[PDB]
Amino acid sequence: IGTKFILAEKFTFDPLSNTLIDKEDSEEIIRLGSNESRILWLLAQRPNEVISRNDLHDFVWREQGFEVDDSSLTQAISTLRKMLKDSTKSPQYVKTVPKRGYQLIARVETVEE
């Protein structure tokens, strides 16, 4: 329902507004793209589960909404990694599973509804 979460105890994420605000820098606010938010939505609906490209497609196919096509899955993941300021060579907050999809490792702390 757009419940606010803190990611990785480093960033405050508002799914409702689709924005990420760095806890260490309140002036640093990054807007999240359509498919980029679709990923985190599926992760919110499937905590601790790997989200595939087919899963993303399923979300798009569901409801009466349409895909804006801001970016691909992998591209959206790259953006998410940048937004969370994760490691390039060995990310510790975003996990990639070969031939399965992607899974968020960042700790998810409930803030408010």
CB 107 within 8 A of CB 48: no
Domain boundaries, the chain: 1-113
Q: Which one-letter DSSP state was computed for residue 51? A: B
- CA–CA distance, 75 with 81 (Å, rounded to integer): 10
**Two tokens at 60?**
């798009």
The side-by-side arrangement of strands in the sheet containing 19-22 is: 25-31, 19-22, 11-14, 4-7, 108-112
What is the Rg, in whole angstroms, of the alpha carbon atoms belonging to the chain? 13
Bridge partners, residue 103, by sequence: 95
Question: Is residue 101 helix, strand or coil?
Answer: strand
- CA–CA distance, 110 with 4 (Å, rounded to integer): 6
Q: Solved by what technique?
A: NMR
Q: What angle do CA 72, 75, 81 make, to 5 degrees?
A: 140
- CA–CA distance, 53 with 71 (Å, rounded to integer): 12
Q: How many CB atoms lie within 10 A of CB 57?
A: 13
